[PDB]
Design a binder for this molecule. Structure first.
Ligand code: NA
Lengths: 298, 299
């Protein structure tokens, strides 16, 4: 079956007051004015649920679903039973309460999808439904999700998963996945944005790399944990794309295809100097575009 | 009709011997080693023909087709009765013969598609076919085009032409296209790569990228050269660059790359100049930008 990619649980803390370095190393501040801290965008978080009422999240969350047999499965109850969904949702979109933590898109909303049970597992139908479900949800304003993220890997290349992948990518949904540690799909899907990881010193088939070592975020019981692993990189990109859609679309005065946004993600990627099989397009440096604008060698 | 995006003739010559500033201002040569100068990539030129026996091009051409009524039309006579097509061919892949002129990818091969007549006009039909021929054409060794370049337009939104554009892209073929100076289609199709123009001063006079379009010299009728200015002269620099991009990037990635990822591989080698997103899309083609940004983190 399909699982949560494995990771070290470096620390559980009760109360933090910082911008997790992951966030600011990727240069999310620099770009928050232009992207409205991501306001307007809805990241669909496909994981283990969430602490709906967690103090950093609750106001960034607009609904969700539960495709897992857990608790019921009562469709209307996706409140986390693991702490991943939480940690992840927090990296993508923790708000500026003047407290705790704040993620890459402290303004993008979240739609919580729980296709993963408390042990971490999921059946593949649950995850293919997770993605399809991402695509089709429209809120009260008919508002829509354009970004989807998972930190899961399956060995079983099924058609059904792929039909959904292409279905999501076919309608302007960016689908973001952490690149496995066996743990291959959906990440080995060429249409998916596959994220691998580096630490803060920028040491380590993928598209980009983002931070994954010693990253703090939300955890269960209004808690906080610090996680090291390959699954922690992806959520930084999901967040990032939220700020990329706002800032791109504003610039081109026009809506953009996800192929055009994939473009836009990868140009906010600086290479580190490992070859491209090792680092894809590079490290996510959000502000790259401004730094290089006026620049030519004579 | 669909037609050549109008443009200026400046000079005709018989003798030139230079690397055109377009070629190196775009930084082809600084990425030739890594790219093998496009070796093994084929660009299909959908235009007015080409002069297959031209000294700078002969060795770059592999085949072509004529889908026009000119010359019979004997499908096997994709020669050029305008001059524009020979010019385009030139900027894409003119060869290094140590004289005359040299293109952006001097080791890419060129498959020539006449879909335009002497006066630069062709029929809405001829281009939709041109695009499917370029997609479906395989070689003696089953080799193919990953690149299509046209620098024509037409006022009509037909599903036939939009289907062909869709068909290329979904089969990993990059549609490169001069955007407009009435000439709205293909360039206005979201899935195409629209190329505006800037001059050598990186000035200008719905786009993805921009390249040089002012006073660009290239091959031209009768084994000669000519200097042309206009939006349509930008495009071939992009078409020839993607040859180099596919090569270097697939080789640094160790993996085949789809057109989508090839498109991104192109945008990320565009330097904004300071103009608006609408005036310059992602910016001017600077092929070497990645190596230049490679180590560069802030603090
Ligand atoms: Na907060």
């Amino acid at each position: 079956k399909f699982r949560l990619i494995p990771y070290k649980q470096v620390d559980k803390v009760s109360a933090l007051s910082e911008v997790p370095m992951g966030v600011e190393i990727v240069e999310a501040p620099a770009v928050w004015r232009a992207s409205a801290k991501g306001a307007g965008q809805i990241i669909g978080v496909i994981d283990t649920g969430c602490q709906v009422d967690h103090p950093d999240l609750a106001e960034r969350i607009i609904g969700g679903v539960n495709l897992t047999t857990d608790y019921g499965g009562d469709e209307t109850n996706f409140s986390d039973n693991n702490g991943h969904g939480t940690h992840v949702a927090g990296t993508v979109a923790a708000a500026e309460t003047g407290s705790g933590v704040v993620g890459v898109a402290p303004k993008a909303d979240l739609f919580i999808i729980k296709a993963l049970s408390g042990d971490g597992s999921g059946e593949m139908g649950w995850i293919a439904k997770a993605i399809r479900y991402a695509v089709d949800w429209r809120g009260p304003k008919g508002e829509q999700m354009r970004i989807i993220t998972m930190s899961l890997g399956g060995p079983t290349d099924s058609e059904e998963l792929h039909d959904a992948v292409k279905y999501a990518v076919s309608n302007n949904v960016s689908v973001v996945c952490a690149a496995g540690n066996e743990f291959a799909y959906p990440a080995a899907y060429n249409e998916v944005i596959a994220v691998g990881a580096v630490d803060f010193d920028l040491r380590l088939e993928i598209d980009i790399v983002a931070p994954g070592v010693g990253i703090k975020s939300t955890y269960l019981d209004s808690g906080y944990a610090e996680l090291s692993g390959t699954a922690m990189a992806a959520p930084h990109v999901a967040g990032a794309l939220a700020l990329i859609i706002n800032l791109a679309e504003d610039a081109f005065k026009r809506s953009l295809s996800e192929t055009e946004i994939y473009a836009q993600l990868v140009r906010r990627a600086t290479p580190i100097g490992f070859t491209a099989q090792a680092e894809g397009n590079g490290f996510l440096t959000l502000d790259l575009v401004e730094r290089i604008t006026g620049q030519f060698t004579e």
